[PDB]
Each structure stands twice: as C-alpha cells, then as structure tokens.
Design a binder for these strands. Structure first.
Ligand SMILES: [Mg+2]
Ligand SMILES: [Mg+2]
Lengths: 124, 124
RNA sequence: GCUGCUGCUGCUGCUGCUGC
RNA sequence: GCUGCUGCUGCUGCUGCUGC
C-alpha cells in the first residue's frame, strides 16, 4: 500500500558484512550512524543514517525530516479523534522519545528536532 | 522499605479540589505544573512540581534533581549486569523519555536535563 | 546492521471507574 | 490532580535465534 514517509533521505542501514567490517576496524561510541523513527497511530517509518560527528554530517542528517514533511506524512492518518504520534531516536546507547497526540504535532516536531540535535552533539 | 529518592524537592501533586478550582479559574497550556519520573530497573520515583513559566520558577524546578542525586539513588540498584534507566517528563501534552542502560547514566542525566529545560521553555 | 522470539519496568493515543 | 482497569503502536534493560 506504498505510504508517503515523513523522511526526505533514504535509509542507509548497513549490510551485516559492512557492519562486521566496521567492527574489526574500530567501539559503541563510534557507530556508523544513528536510528530514528516516526510513528502515527500504528504505522511507523524508520531510518538508519550515517553520521560521523562532523558539522557537515550533522547538517545533512538534520535535514532528514522537517515539520512540513512530518505533517504531510502524518495527516494521511488524521480524522476527528486524536491518534498518538512518536518520534524516537537512538545514538551511543541513549534513546530519546518524544510523544503526544496529533493535536500537538507542531510542538512534538519542535521538541523532536532539539532532542535530535542535542543527542547527536553528545560529548563523548 | 523506605527508599532514597533521586529528587531534592518533595512532591506537589494537587488535591482533586485544588485541581477543580484551578480548572474553574482558567486550559491545558496553563496547568499547575509538570510531572517527571526516574526509573531504575523496576523501581520508579515520581514528582508533580508546580511551574508557572517564569525564570525564577524554571530555576527552582531545574533544581529538583542533579547528576549526583540521580547517581546516588541509582547506585542502590546496581551490580554486574546493567539495568534499564529512564527519565521521563510530561508538560502541555508532550512526553519526553530518555533511557538506556546503567552504564550510560551520566549521558542519560545530561540529555534528561536538556530535554527538561527545552520542554519547560516550549513557546506556547 | 537486520528479521524473529522469551522474561522484565516504563511511554503515547483511546476507553471507562476511583475519590476518589 | 490521584487510584484502578479495557483495547491499541512504540521504548529501555535482559534473553536467545535469523542472515541472517
Ligand atoms: Mg528507535
Ligand atoms: Mg510520566
């Protein structure tokens, strides 16, 4: 039923071989990147994104979704009753989740973006 | 079995009558405060704190836990295997949760504090 | 990195009761 | 505001399998 995703960048999950190779070359503080997801009701969209802790890379992955792209994907699932909406992100052993009802989506996005930036800039 | 809390401020949950009164006087954007919790393994500590969106109030409630008060409370429950640790806060219809294993507690506290400040400064 | 599952706190949305 | 429950995605920790 091909769904519009909130994401503006394609998934970059490593293959199992690429993951083994990265592991032989390096440590949980320097993974290949991070995982993030958006959930609206019972539908979830997920991304693995490469991230290397540079300014350029930060800027690139911050661009993976916007308030507008989230609203566009989310509103496919809206009606009279509120549904639940959840952003989640995992990096270096820490998961941050931001959730609330669909009436609060704009506030959710604003808190999701700040969490994502702060987590990705976590000092080692 | 009276447990040491990660919290430095006592609970301020309103009574049902105080809540009804506040409701007659005012709207979900101006609650009496916020709720936060700290979970270590299966034990949870909770607080309802009064908050009025002023600088003085923000300063007061940011003092309800620190990295040290959290580590003191948490370490009671530690051993060789990791346990799961979770901070959560809810204000104005948004929940943030920050979790991970006991090996990442410091990082959890750093992210928890930032989420708490950002959420409590959420522009209406 | 992924799919699948077992035990174990918690979270969103909805639903109803307590005083309640 | 609280206690208790019903249905419904997700999250931490632990456990094992996939290629896997
Ligand atoms: Mg995730
Ligand atoms: Mg809570």
């Amino acid at each position: 039923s091909h769904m519009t995703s909130p994401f503006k960048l394609p998934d970059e999950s490593p293959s199992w071989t690429e993951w083994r190779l990265h592991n032989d070359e390096t440590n949980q503080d320097n993974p290949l990147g991070f995982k993030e997801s958006w959930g609206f009701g019972k539908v979830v969209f997920k991304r693995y994104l490469r991230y290397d802790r540079t300014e350029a890379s930060l800027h690139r992955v911050l661009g993976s979704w916007t308030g507008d792209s989230v609203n566009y994907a989310a509103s496919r699932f809206f009606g009279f009753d509120q549904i639940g909406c959840t952003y989640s992100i995992r990096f270096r052993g820490v998961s941050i989740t931001v959730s609330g009802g669909s009436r609060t989506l704009q506030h959710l996005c604003e808190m999701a973006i700040r969490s994502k930036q702060e987590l990705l800039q976590l000092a080692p």
